[PDB]
Amino acid sequence: KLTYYTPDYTPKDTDLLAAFRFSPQPGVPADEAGAAIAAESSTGTWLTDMDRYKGKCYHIEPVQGEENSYFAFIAYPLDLFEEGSVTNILTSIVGNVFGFKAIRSLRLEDIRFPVALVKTFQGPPHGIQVERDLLNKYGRPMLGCTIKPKLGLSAKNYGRAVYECLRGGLDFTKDDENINSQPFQRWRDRFLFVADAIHKSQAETGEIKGHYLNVTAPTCEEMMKRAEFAKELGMPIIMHDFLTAGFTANTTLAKWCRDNGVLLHIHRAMHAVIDRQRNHGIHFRVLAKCLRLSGGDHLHSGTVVGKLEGDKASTLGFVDLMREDHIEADRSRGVFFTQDWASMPGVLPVASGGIHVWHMPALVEIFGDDSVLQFGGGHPWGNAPGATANRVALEACVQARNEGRDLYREGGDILREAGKWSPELAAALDLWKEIKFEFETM
């Protein structure tokens, strides 16, 4: 007598949907699991018509190949959830159901936010289209880069290095993600000198420059104190670690950003703790839809070339999920439900770390124009030449695409040619004597 498993229920459009994958313990039948998961996340107690509030588990299927793994689909009434509150959404869905003694492992795979609920969130403070008009950057991805090292570098000097980069032809620069306010680099100082670099480099290049200032702080009070002061300096962009800081603190910051027209970069520190394992946790695909909802203009989607296949398809999927307005359900790219966004603006995926210049044509063919290609560390001539190299390589790539060339099959040449014009680009390319495997012939 289990009213939490309804195999015939066709979901309403206004429902919230969730796809879990689970390994049931020896003995537990799959329908017992999906129902318990449904009950716990919703009502769960076991004269009214409660039916409205009870979350229903409406479909169960075994994962192709994998033995002892099932997908469980659950529908949630629009009334279960507080507005604008991802926090509440999370607490409702991932709050408890992960601890079940009758479950070996549970992983949340995707969520269908109903348009009716999406409408109650602010979303990105600006989003792709607005931000291009704000920065005046069009027709190409955006170039950023990270400064190494972390601390052990004075404000005056960090700032100097930031200037060297931006002046060398890069759009953005970023604080190391564990840089907040330590015994030898208090934020107020980092902010002063970074601001100075932007203003100078910007005037010198005649191009809009920005550095993501890490306002991530201990308290909401402190976090605001910094954003407030980054505003005072006329900075166009700040960064925030949405996961380690938390979703409440973020929702707050993302609104403030819209009010002060400050762009909001989002670093996913500590994501790997949750999203790494195939069998347990939450997938980054979900956290990304969440980060879209709470708020933010950029978001680190990780690179697609260091990591291999299956990240590829899954990453392409959720890049689409944070960029577009309507996303067709496609299981092969890891998209479980069709997602709409009702004209909620898109988030710029940020391809971060482990990537150097050679990757450039690939990155452009994969991510296209609406991306941020970060480049942290290192060119044999310094920051500026390194920046120039990366910049020319990019400019060369875009035009080669627009001319109509195959960035996979021709990536090599498109760079080698451009290199005959930028000695900085030459030095960099020549730094990587690349390896190719041919089998023995004759």
Partner: protein
């Protein structure tokens, strides 16, 4: 004479005890999953535990699904802990025989 039927009975006993342990697992797994059924099962089981094989027979007549389930659990617990018991009951008694003889030697 002794050891042959001493071990024979002990096997039948262990069989019955794991069934109880399979029951208490299915109890807890249902404790979160289906309180109603968990409540029913617990009350029905009370006292019965004595004989493990008689118990499944009794449970089969009431709710066959639950009888089957316990059967798969007891089978899983046996296969996964059986090999390790001899290296524990022996070294558990040997640790208890050296410790209690220390108490006698002083007082």
């Amino acid at each position: 004479m002794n050891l042959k039927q001493i071990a024979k009975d002990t096997a039948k006993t262990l069989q019955s005890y794991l069934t109880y342990q399979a029951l208490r697992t299915v109890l807890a797994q249902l404790g979160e999953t289906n309180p109603p059924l968990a409540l029913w099962l617990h009350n029905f089981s009370a006292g019965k535990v004595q004989d493990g094989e008689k118990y499944i027979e009794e449970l089969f007549l009431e709710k066959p699904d639950l009888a089957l389930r316990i059967m798969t659990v007891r089978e899983h617990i046996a296969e996964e802990i059986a090999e390790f018991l001899p290296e524990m009951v022996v070294t558990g008694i040997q640790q208890a025989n050296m410790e209690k003889r220390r108490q006698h030697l002083e007082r």
